[PDB]
Design an enzyme around this catalytic site. Structure first.
Site, PDB file in Angstrom:
ATOM      1  N   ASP A 120       0.812  -1.203   0.000  1.00 43.93           N
ATOM      2  CA  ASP A 120       0.000   0.000   0.000  1.00 43.93           C
ATOM      3  C   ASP A 120       0.856   1.269   0.000  1.00 43.93           C
ATOM      4  N   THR A 158      -6.974   3.403  -2.120  1.00 41.94           N
ATOM      5  CA  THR A 158      -6.752   1.968  -1.870  1.00 41.94           C
ATOM      6  C   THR A 158      -7.805   1.019  -2.399  1.00 41.94           C
ATOM      7  N   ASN A 179     -12.850   5.533  -1.514  1.00 42.38           N
ATOM      8  CA  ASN A 179     -12.783   4.909  -0.171  1.00 42.38           C
ATOM      9  C   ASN A 179     -14.053   5.184   0.634  1.00 42.38           C
ATOM     10  N   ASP A 260       2.222   2.874   3.139  1.00 46.41           N
ATOM     11  CA  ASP A 260       1.203   3.904   3.125  1.00 46.41           C
ATOM     12  C   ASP A 260       0.950   4.507   4.523  1.00 46.41           C
ATOM     13  N   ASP A 307      -0.559  -0.249  -4.944  1.00 48.01           N
ATOM     14  CA  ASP A 307      -1.836   0.274  -5.385  1.00 48.01           C
ATOM     15  C   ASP A 307      -1.812   1.755  -5.879  1.00 48.01           C
ATOM     16  N   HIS A 308      -0.942   2.597  -5.310  1.00 48.04           N
ATOM     17  CA  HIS A 308      -0.853   4.036  -5.708  1.00 48.04           C
ATOM     18  C   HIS A 308       0.414   4.530  -4.994  1.00 48.04           C
ATOM     19  N   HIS A 418      -2.790  10.792  -0.933  1.00 53.03           N
ATOM     20  CA  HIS A 418      -2.805  10.292  -2.309  1.00 53.03           C
ATOM     21  C   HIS A 418      -4.261  10.316  -2.706  1.00 53.03           C
ATOM     22  N   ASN A 683     -24.293   9.657 -23.089  1.00 49.21           N
ATOM     23  CA  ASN A 683     -24.547   9.018 -21.810  1.00 49.21           C
ATOM     24  C   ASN A 683     -23.265   8.738 -21.011  1.00 49.21           C
ATOM     25  N   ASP A 685     -20.644   6.885 -21.066  1.00 47.00           N
ATOM     26  CA  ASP A 685     -20.263   5.537 -20.727  1.00 47.00           C
ATOM     27  C   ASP A 685     -18.911   5.124 -21.344  1.00 47.00           C
TER      28      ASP A 685
HETATM   29  C1  LIG Z   1     -15.141  -1.891 -19.119  1.00 45.58           C
HETATM   30  O1  LIG Z   1     -15.535  -3.253 -19.197  1.00 45.58           O
HETATM   31  C2  LIG Z   1     -16.837  -3.586 -18.812  1.00 45.58           C
HETATM   32  C3  LIG Z   1     -17.027  -5.117 -18.793  1.00 45.58           C
HETATM   33  O2  LIG Z   1     -16.934  -5.628 -20.126  1.00 45.58           O
HETATM   34  C4  LIG Z   1     -17.858  -2.880 -19.709  1.00 45.58           C
HETATM   35  O3  LIG Z   1     -19.060  -2.952 -19.007  1.00 45.58           O
HETATM   36  C5  LIG Z   1     -20.054  -3.780 -19.616  1.00 45.58           C
HETATM   37  O4  LIG Z   1     -20.714  -2.990 -20.580  1.00 45.58           O
HETATM   38  C6  LIG Z   1     -21.829  -3.574 -21.241  1.00 45.58           C
HETATM   39  C7  LIG Z   1     -22.476  -2.533 -22.176  1.00 45.58           C
HETATM   40  O5  LIG Z   1     -22.804  -1.343 -21.447  1.00 45.58           O
HETATM   41  C8  LIG Z   1     -22.869  -4.088 -20.231  1.00 45.58           C
HETATM   42  O6  LIG Z   1     -23.839  -4.858 -20.930  1.00 45.58           O
HETATM   43  C9  LIG Z   1     -25.189  -4.629 -20.423  1.00 45.58           C
HETATM   44  O7  LIG Z   1     -25.501  -5.576 -19.411  1.00 45.58           O
HETATM   45  C10 LIG Z   1     -26.779  -5.493 -18.813  1.00 45.58           C
HETATM   46  C11 LIG Z   1     -26.832  -6.625 -17.790  1.00 45.58           C
HETATM   47  O8  LIG Z   1     -25.714  -6.466 -16.945  1.00 45.58           O
HETATM   48  C12 LIG Z   1     -25.873  -7.141 -15.675  1.00 45.58           C
HETATM   49  O9  LIG Z   1     -25.259  -8.420 -15.641  1.00 45.58           O
HETATM   50  C13 LIG Z   1     -23.855  -8.395 -15.910  1.00 45.58           C
HETATM   51  C14 LIG Z   1     -23.294  -9.806 -16.120  1.00 45.58           C
HETATM   52  O10 LIG Z   1     -23.345 -10.544 -14.916  1.00 45.58           O
HETATM   53  C15 LIG Z   1     -22.579 -11.784 -15.007  1.00 45.58           C
HETATM   54  O11 LIG Z   1     -21.327 -11.733 -14.322  1.00 45.58           O
HETATM   55  C16 LIG Z   1     -21.474 -11.300 -12.961  1.00 45.58           C
HETATM   56  C17 LIG Z   1     -20.108 -11.184 -12.280  1.00 45.58           C
HETATM   57  O12 LIG Z   1     -19.466 -10.102 -12.926  1.00 45.58           O
HETATM   58  C18 LIG Z   1     -22.498 -12.133 -12.152  1.00 45.58           C
HETATM   59  O13 LIG Z   1     -22.874 -11.328 -11.048  1.00 45.58           O
HETATM   60  C19 LIG Z   1     -23.754 -12.556 -12.955  1.00 45.58           C
HETATM   61  O14 LIG Z   1     -24.467 -13.636 -12.383  1.00 45.58           O
HETATM   62  C20 LIG Z   1     -23.465 -12.899 -14.427  1.00 45.58           C
HETATM   63  O15 LIG Z   1     -22.936 -14.217 -14.572  1.00 45.58           O
HETATM   64  C21 LIG Z   1     -23.149  -7.617 -14.793  1.00 45.58           C
HETATM   65  O16 LIG Z   1     -21.759  -7.544 -15.026  1.00 45.58           O
HETATM   66  C22 LIG Z   1     -23.740  -6.210 -14.656  1.00 45.58           C
HETATM   67  O17 LIG Z   1     -23.087  -5.582 -13.560  1.00 45.58           O
HETATM   68  C23 LIG Z   1     -23.319  -4.156 -13.439  1.00 45.58           C
HETATM   69  O18 LIG Z   1     -24.432  -3.801 -12.614  1.00 45.58           O
HETATM   70  C24 LIG Z   1     -24.303  -4.208 -11.249  1.00 45.58           C
HETATM   71  C25 LIG Z   1     -25.550  -3.830 -10.474  1.00 45.58           C
HETATM   72  O19 LIG Z   1     -26.630  -4.263 -11.251  1.00 45.58           O
HETATM   73  C26 LIG Z   1     -23.048  -3.602 -10.605  1.00 45.58           C
HETATM   74  O20 LIG Z   1     -22.862  -4.084  -9.289  1.00 45.58           O
HETATM   75  C27 LIG Z   1     -21.798  -3.880 -11.454  1.00 45.58           C
HETATM   76  O21 LIG Z   1     -20.695  -3.192 -10.888  1.00 45.58           O
HETATM   77  C28 LIG Z   1     -22.062  -3.447 -12.904  1.00 45.58           C
HETATM   78  O22 LIG Z   1     -22.324  -2.055 -12.859  1.00 45.58           O
HETATM   79  C29 LIG Z   1     -21.818  -1.291 -13.969  1.00 45.58           C
HETATM   80  O23 LIG Z   1     -22.550  -1.537 -15.173  1.00 45.58           O
HETATM   81  C30 LIG Z   1     -23.883  -1.024 -15.250  1.00 45.58           C
HETATM   82  C31 LIG Z   1     -24.494  -1.415 -16.600  1.00 45.58           C
HETATM   83  O24 LIG Z   1     -24.597  -2.817 -16.655  1.00 45.58           O
HETATM   84  C32 LIG Z   1     -23.876   0.497 -15.000  1.00 45.58           C
HETATM   85  O25 LIG Z   1     -25.181   1.042 -15.061  1.00 45.58           O
HETATM   86  C33 LIG Z   1     -23.202   0.808 -13.653  1.00 45.58           C
HETATM   87  O26 LIG Z   1     -23.022   2.187 -13.500  1.00 45.58           O
HETATM   88  C34 LIG Z   1     -21.812   0.190 -13.545  1.00 45.58           C
HETATM   89  O27 LIG Z   1     -20.949   0.971 -14.344  1.00 45.58           O
HETATM   90  C35 LIG Z   1     -25.278  -6.301 -14.539  1.00 45.58           C
HETATM   91  O28 LIG Z   1     -25.643  -6.890 -13.306  1.00 45.58           O
HETATM   92  C36 LIG Z   1     -27.892  -5.584 -19.864  1.00 45.58           C
HETATM   93  O29 LIG Z   1     -29.125  -5.370 -19.217  1.00 45.58           O
HETATM   94  C37 LIG Z   1     -27.698  -4.571 -21.010  1.00 45.58           C
HETATM   95  O30 LIG Z   1     -28.693  -4.808 -22.017  1.00 45.58           O
HETATM   96  C38 LIG Z   1     -29.330  -3.671 -22.698  1.00 45.58           C
HETATM   97  O31 LIG Z   1     -28.647  -3.229 -23.878  1.00 45.58           O
HETATM   98  C39 LIG Z   1     -28.569  -4.276 -24.857  1.00 45.58           C
HETATM   99  C40 LIG Z   1     -27.449  -4.105 -25.895  1.00 45.58           C
HETATM  100  O32 LIG Z   1     -27.055  -5.394 -26.332  1.00 45.58           O
HETATM  101  C41 LIG Z   1     -29.930  -4.498 -25.522  1.00 45.58           C
HETATM  102  O33 LIG Z   1     -29.890  -5.671 -26.316  1.00 45.58           O
HETATM  103  C42 LIG Z   1     -31.048  -4.657 -24.482  1.00 45.58           C
HETATM  104  O34 LIG Z   1     -32.241  -4.134 -25.059  1.00 45.58           O
HETATM  105  C43 LIG Z   1     -30.800  -4.027 -23.076  1.00 45.58           C
HETATM  106  O35 LIG Z   1     -31.638  -2.893 -22.989  1.00 45.58           O
HETATM  107  C44 LIG Z   1     -32.593  -3.031 -21.918  1.00 45.58           C
HETATM  108  O36 LIG Z   1     -32.153  -2.295 -20.787  1.00 45.58           O
HETATM  109  C45 LIG Z   1     -31.969  -0.901 -21.069  1.00 45.58           C
HETATM  110  C46 LIG Z   1     -31.233  -0.174 -19.938  1.00 45.58           C
HETATM  111  O37 LIG Z   1     -31.635  -0.698 -18.692  1.00 45.58           O
HETATM  112  C47 LIG Z   1     -33.321  -0.268 -21.431  1.00 45.58           C
HETATM  113  O38 LIG Z   1     -33.156   1.083 -21.788  1.00 45.58           O
HETATM  114  C48 LIG Z   1     -33.947  -1.019 -22.619  1.00 45.58           C
HETATM  115  O39 LIG Z   1     -35.190  -0.430 -22.974  1.00 45.58           O
HETATM  116  C49 LIG Z   1     -33.989  -2.548 -22.361  1.00 45.58           C
HETATM  117  O40 LIG Z   1     -34.956  -2.912 -21.383  1.00 45.58           O
HETATM  118  C50 LIG Z   1     -26.243  -4.655 -21.549  1.00 45.58           C
HETATM  119  O41 LIG Z   1     -26.015  -5.808 -22.337  1.00 45.58           O
HETATM  120  C51 LIG Z   1     -22.227  -4.867 -19.077  1.00 45.58           C
HETATM  121  O42 LIG Z   1     -23.137  -5.165 -18.033  1.00 45.58           O
HETATM  122  C52 LIG Z   1     -21.030  -4.108 -18.491  1.00 45.58           C
HETATM  123  N1  LIG Z   1     -20.355  -4.922 -17.479  1.00 45.58           N
HETATM  124  C53 LIG Z   1     -19.780  -4.498 -16.334  1.00 45.58           C
HETATM  125  C54 LIG Z   1     -19.111  -5.535 -15.457  1.00 45.58           C
HETATM  126  O43 LIG Z   1     -19.767  -3.327 -15.960  1.00 45.58           O
HETATM  127  C55 LIG Z   1     -17.469  -1.417 -19.881  1.00 45.58           C
HETATM  128  O44 LIG Z   1     -18.212  -0.925 -20.961  1.00 45.58           O
HETATM  129  C56 LIG Z   1     -15.958  -1.200 -20.188  1.00 45.58           C
HETATM  130  N2  LIG Z   1     -15.672   0.211 -20.252  1.00 45.58           N
HETATM  131  C57 LIG Z   1     -15.207   0.830 -21.364  1.00 45.58           C
HETATM  132  C58 LIG Z   1     -14.980   2.309 -21.324  1.00 45.58           C
HETATM  133  O45 LIG Z   1     -14.902   0.247 -22.395  1.00 45.58           O
HETATM  134 CA   LIG Z   2      -3.548   2.254  -0.660  1.00 44.89          CA
HETATM  135 CA   LIG Z   3     -22.058   6.375 -25.111  1.00 47.76          CA
HETATM  136 CL   LIG Z   4     -12.798   8.644  -1.947  1.00 50.64          CL
END
Ligand SMILES: *[C@@H]1O[C@H](CO)[C@@H](O[C@@H]2O[C@H](CO)[C@@H](O[C@@H]3O[C@H](CO[C@H]4O[C@H](CO[C@H]5O[C@H](CO)[C@@H](O)[C@H](O)[C@@H]5O)[C@@H](O)[C@H](O[C@H]5O[C@H](CO)[C@@H](O)[C@H](O)[C@@H]5O[C@H]5O[C@H](CO)[C@@H](O)[C@H](O)[C@@H]5O)[C@@H]4O)[C@@H](O)[C@H](O[C@H]4O[C@H](CO)[C@@H](O)[C@H](O)[C@@H]4O[C@H]4O[C@H](CO)[C@@H](O)[C@H](O)[C@@H]4O)[C@@H]3O)[C@H](O)[C@H]2NC(C)=O)[C@H](O)[C@H]1NC(C)=O
Ligand SMILES: [Ca+2]
Ligand SMILES: [Ca+2]
Ligand SMILES: [Cl-]
Ligand SMILES: O=C(OCc1ccc(OCC(F)(F)F)cc1F)N1CCC2(CC1)CN(C(=O)[C@@H]1CCc3[nH]nnc3C1)C2
Ligand SMILES: O=C(OCc1ccc(OCC(F)(F)F)cc1F)N1CCC2(CC1)CN(C(=O)[C@H]1CCc3[nH]nnc3C1)C2
Ligand SMILES: O=C(OCc1ccc(OCC(F)(F)F)cc1F)N1CCC2(CC1)CN(C(=O)[C@H]1CCc3[nH]nnc3C1)C2
Ligand code: NA
Ligand code: NA
EC number: 3.1.4.39
Length: 804
Positions: A120, A158, A179, A260, A307-308, A418, A683, A685
């Protein structure tokens, strides 16, 4: 609750037990659920941590913290220096390094184990500056693979960094955005102290231990209670490595809260800092002597990672929101080395973020923080796409704090902190990899900590969960990979339009003074429109379009573009500016000149009338008129297909870049190839918007307004070769400029562009990879370089800090 039962023969058990039972794992202390005898049996301390001359051959005594008795090796529980003190062996640090060409493991090891030794606040310069006092670390570093530094993620705190190391994800995606956090959907608050951080709901992504578990690889724990001392953590790892094959984990973590903890008290280079660095080095020595005893020191891969870093920060360098805001009491500030602001009460409809930002902008001469709406932060920080990140953010100057008011700081404790922008030198941290899978005595360029998850997954033969690393970009770290990436397939192939429209078909309200009129110079202009000069302006192949769309390749004497019929402007414009190239100005008669493109229908064109009617919006050009190669070729730059919408405030930035900086870069770098274009990320993202996501159009039109403009500026790494004739590795710098209707971000903007524009561009430096996510394009498809090397190049960030 229920406690009774015993840790007898279960100390630091790997599988958790369910109530009824008391727990004996390294997490039990945090749940006040350890068995009554946990400390007694599991946390033995008698006789300390080292064998002495007399303890040799002793009679086993189970009360000792570690053993020097004859049977200790096979029991797996000798003191780490046993064989040196009792068997005449040498300390691992004293042995010369010998290349580890292949893993040398005991029978029954299916794969080389991975040990992650995480420290750390281990600032990158400690490697050179503490080198006299860290001989074990220095042997790891010089015999293994090392980078001069590793870039943490923002905030350089961290929890965001440890969890990013574990997942390959940006904090915005993993959820641990600081944090301390508030989550409005949960209605809950997360802190360093407290039980709240133990709830599952905070922790997104898929950290390495879970990736491992789900795929059949067993993991030691990635949580050590603060009261288990380092020596015991090491012995517990060493014990676990003596388990039978069916039980033994393959991946392990060690964590030190040092340096740290000390750095906060004494500053990064405080005289009190030598000791904690000695003590970490001694721990590393214990692990390595321990591995050597188990004959595992040429079998295990070891990662030494921070980490940093840590910066000099004191209480007198605190800015107070109370010197700026009169409504101070209606807000909440997450304070310190970053600021995050939200309304104290959401039943307050008089709370105005707009006016809060205004009262914080450019208010004092040497103001040590800068407010932003989160979507306006530099895109390289990737710090916006999470409901836990407040809309208002303060980026705090290195060496400072922000607080709400003076009472908050007094009701000076500390000399280090940090959390700043992750480009800052003092925040940089370390990476060393040592083992059979890593390279021997190799230096690699700095890289981002988001990349390591893929590598740790490779090291363990796992398939990584989807993450933000670019898998293959760190292949140059490894002696053997197992990951050979392949270029993504182009989804949309271009059209190549010829001349298909007469001038009179267009009613764009555009005009140009171009009616100014020989088979030599008219077969020449035909060849230019057929891409005769295309090898000059398109040096690395055309970018590939990775999504479904309709677009045209347009060729010209001085530039080539991929023109989108959907967004009505280029997705990319490619041109080369040699060292010899000349800057001209736009002739007076051509100031307002916009010409229809006879290759592209009126229906897929922008129009000048919309810009006339839109009082907010003007326009600019992607290939700059100033750089045209002849007076006749300049007409090409005024084509309606090279126009893009631009706020007058942003035209100041863009004009300076095109008129002054491109030429400057060309002469400094011996030519540059430039690829520029628009970005739409409404948006926030970090990902290319679809058409139905655009929130703004040039008024009364279907011309969408970009949120950002990018450029990718490529030249030859060996700058004795010109950019258009380079035989080896490339050099790149890129940026993603926010397309803003004011220049409030730059406090010096009323001055001349030479005093603020380049500083803005530097702030908004970017990796080519950030621009790929944002545009759905894939660059450098045709070069003579290996793909691994191109991936490294695409993840490169030019930071503009001075040397380390
Ligand atoms: C960095 O890399 C990451 C990872 O590759 C990139 O992030 C990915 O980006 C994808 C595109 O944005 C996104 O796809 C989404 O997924 C939606 C479902 O996602 C949920 O499930 C995920 C998978 O879970 C599996 O694995 C985990 C362990 O990791 C297990 O728990 C599960 O059992 C599964 O096995 C899961 O990862 C995801 O987690 C997020 O949300 C959690 C809380 O719910 C958080 O705790 C967690 O930290 C994640 O949070 C982040 O992501 C969300 C967005 O998901 C964001 O809002 C948060 O701020 C945070 O940043 C979920 O639990 C799925 O519903 C989406 O589908 C819509 O769009 C598709 C396009 O194909 C359409 O077909 C479809 O119509 C659908 O639209 C519907 O919903 C719309 C909006 O709600 C609605 O308007 C519409 O009308 C429809 O109803 C889409 O496929 C990935 O989820 C995301 N993954 C992660 C891990 O973040 C990221 O982009 C990269 N960054 C860069 C800059 O490149
Ligand atoms: Ca640290
Ligand atoms: Ca965008
Ligand atoms: Cl913080
Ligand atoms: O294994 C873990 O716990 C141990 C641990 C946690 C953290 C740490 O160290 C943290 C640091 F690295 F910072 F030090 C060291 C550690 F042992 N975690 C992963 C498994 C869950 C508990 C937490 C997350 N779960 C969920 O159900 C998530 C809900 C919301 C979500 N969104 N997307 N998917 C999800 C799934 C169960
Ligand atoms: O045992 C642990 O960590 C294992 C681990 C977890 C995850 C990994 O992921 C990185 C990997 F994947 F690459 F390994 C790598 C790893 F070692 N923990 C010990 C308990 C705390 C979390 C870390 C809670 N805490 C704090 O609050 C410290 C904050 C700052 C500080 N400064 N001075 N004092 C402190 C206290 C430290
Ligand atoms: O026990 C677990 O998660 C609790 C926990 C433990 C420690 C934390 O954080 C430690 C820190 F905050 F200090 F870093 C944060 C936490 F959710 N799980 C791990 C194993 C499984 C159950 C849930 C997931 N699969 C089975
Ligand atoms: Na206008
Ligand atoms: Na300004």
């Amino acid at each position: 609750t229920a406690t009774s039962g015993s840790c007898k023969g279960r100390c630091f058990e790997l599988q958790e037990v369910g109530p009824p039972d008391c727990r004996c794992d390294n997490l039990c202390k945090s749940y006040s659920s350890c068995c009554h005898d946990f400390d007694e049996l599991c946390l033995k301390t008698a006789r300390g941590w080292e064998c002495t001359k007399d303890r040799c051959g002793e009679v086993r005594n189970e009360e000792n913290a570690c053993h020097c008795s004859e049977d200790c090796l096979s029991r797996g529980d000798c003191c780490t220096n046993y064989q040196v003190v009792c068997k005449g062996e040498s300390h691992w640090v004293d042995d010369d390094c010998e290349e580890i060409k292949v893993p040398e493991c005991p029978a029954g090891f299916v794969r080389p184990p991975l040990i992650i030794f995480s420290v750390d606040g281990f600032r990158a310069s400690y490697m050179k500056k503490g080198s006299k006092v860290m001989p074990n670390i220095e042997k790891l570093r010089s015999c293994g693979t090392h980078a001069p530094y590793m870039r943490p993620v923002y905030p350089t705190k961290t929890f965001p960094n440890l969890y990013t190391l574990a997942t390959g994800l940006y904090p915005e995606s993993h959820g641990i955005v600081g944090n301390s956090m508030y989550d409005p959907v949960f209605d809950a608050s997360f802190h360093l102290r407290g039980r709240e951080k133990f709830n599952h709901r905070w922790w997104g992504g898929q950290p390495l231990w879970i990736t491992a578990t789900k795929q059949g690889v067993r993991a030691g724990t990635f949580f050590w209670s603060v009261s288990i001392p380092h020596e015991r953590r090491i012995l517990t790892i060493l014990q676990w490595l003596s388990l039978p094959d069916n039980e033994r984990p393959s991946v392990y973590a060690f964590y030190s809260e040092q340096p740290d903890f000390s750095g906060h008290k004494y500053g990064p280079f405080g005289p009190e800092m030598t000791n904690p660095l000695r003590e970490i080095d001694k721990t590393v020595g214990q692990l390595m002597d321990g591995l050597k005893q188990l004959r595992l020191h040429r079998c295990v891969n070891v990662i030494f990672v921070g980490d940093h870093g840590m910066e000099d920060v004191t209480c007198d360098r605190t800015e107070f929101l109370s010197n700026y805001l009169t409504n101070v009491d209606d807000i909440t500030l997450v304070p310190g080395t970053l600021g995050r602001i939200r309304a104290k009460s959401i039943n307050n409809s008089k709370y105005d973020p707009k006016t809060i930002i205004a009262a914080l902008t450019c208010k004092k001469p040497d103001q040590h923080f800068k407010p932003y709406m989160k979507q306006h932060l530099p895109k390289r920080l990737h710090y916006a796409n999470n409901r836990r990140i407040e809309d208002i953010h303060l980026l705090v100057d290195r060496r400072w704090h922000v607080a709400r008011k003076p009472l908050d700081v007094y009701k000076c404790f500390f000399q280090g902190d940090h959390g700043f922008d992750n480009k800052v030198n003092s925040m940089q941290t370390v990476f060393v990899g040592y083992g059979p899978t890593f390279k021997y005595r190799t230096k690699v360029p700095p890289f981002e900590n988001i990349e390591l998850y893929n590598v740790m997954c490779d090291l363990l033969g796992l398939k990584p969960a989807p993450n933000n690393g670019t898998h293959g970009s760190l292949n140059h770290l490894l002696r053997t990979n197992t990951f050979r990436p392949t270029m993504p397939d182009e989804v949309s192939r271009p059209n190549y339009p010829g001349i298909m429209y007469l001038q009179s078909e267009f009613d764009l309200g555009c005009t140009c003074d171009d009616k100014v009129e020989n088979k030599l110079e008219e077969l020449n202009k035909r060849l230019h429109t057929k891409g005769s000069t295309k090898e000059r302006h398109l040096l690395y192949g055309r970018p590939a379009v990775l999504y479904r769309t309709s677009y045209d390749i347009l060729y010209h004497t001085d530039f080539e573009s991929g023109y989108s019929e959907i967004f009505l402007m280029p997705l990319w414009t490619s041109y080369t500016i040699s060292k010899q190239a000349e800057v001209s100005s736009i002739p007076e008669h051509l100031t307002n000149c916009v010409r229809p493109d006879v290759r592209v229908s009126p229906g897929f064109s922008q129009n000048c009338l919309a810009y006339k009617n839109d009082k907010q919006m003007s326009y600019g050009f992607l290939f700059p008129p100033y750089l045209s190669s002849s007076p006749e070729a300049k007409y090409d730059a005024f084509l309606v297909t090279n126009m893009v919408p631009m706020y007058p405030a942003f035209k100041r930035v863009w004009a300076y870049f095109q008129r002054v900086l491109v030429k400057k870069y060309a002469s400094e770098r011996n030519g540059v190839n430039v690829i520029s274009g628009p970005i739409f990320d409404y948006n926030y993202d970090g990902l290319r918007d679809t058409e139905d996501e655009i929130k703004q159009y040039v008024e009364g039109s279907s011309i969408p307004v970009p949120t950002h403009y990018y450029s990718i500026i490529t030249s030859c790494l060996d700058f004795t070769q010109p950019a258009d004739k380079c035989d080896g590795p490339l050099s790149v710098s890129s940026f993603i400029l926010p397309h803003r209707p004011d220049n409030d971000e730059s406090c010096n903007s009323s001055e001349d562009e030479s005093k603020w524009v380049e500083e803005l561009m530097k702030m908004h430096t970017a990796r080519v990879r950030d621009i790929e996510h944002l545009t759905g394009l894939d660059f450098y498809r045709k070069t003579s370089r290996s793909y691994s090397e191109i991936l490294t190049l695409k993840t490169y960030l030019h930071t503009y800090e001075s040397e380390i």
